[PDB]
């Protein structure tokens, strides 16, 4: 079902880990910035599914906007099996670095 659209442009999958605290505006507001990606990308944007929060190995260094406070052991594991033009992925990187509830966001390009 996914090989329908990739005549024309590319395919990706972004892994992004989250804060473990909030349960509200986490599925919501990060899907709203996924709608910011929808203004950017506008392709078969499906399967943005969530993975359960588990203890990771080692993480420090949240870098809140002038917080620089929280160490972590847990995080919500979002991954977006999205699909876009190869133009404007670096603004997705800046969007997934600058926002607070998204730390350590590594995108990929499955083949």
């Amino acid at each position: 079902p996914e090989p329908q659209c990739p005549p024309g442009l590319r395919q990706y999958e972004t892994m992004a880990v989250l804060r473990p605290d909030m349960t509200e505006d986490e599925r919501l507001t990060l899907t709203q910035k996924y709608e910011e990606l929808l203004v950017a990308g506008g392709a078969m944007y499906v399967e943005v599914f969530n993975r359960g929060v588990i203890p990771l190995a080692y993480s420090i260094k949240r870098k809140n906007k002038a917080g620089e406070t929280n160490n972590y052991l847990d995080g919500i594991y979002l991954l977006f099996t999205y699909f876009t033009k190869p133009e404007s992925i670096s603004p997705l990187e800046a969007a997934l670095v600058t926002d607070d509830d998204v730390i350590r966001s590594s995108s990929f390009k499955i083949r």
Binding site: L56, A57, Y58, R104, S106, F108
Partner: peptide, 11 residues
């Protein structure tokens, strides 16, 4: 090494 970045695995 990707999973090493995501702190799924210890260094």
């Amino acid at each position: 090494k990707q999973a090493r970045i995501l702190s799924l695995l210890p260094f």
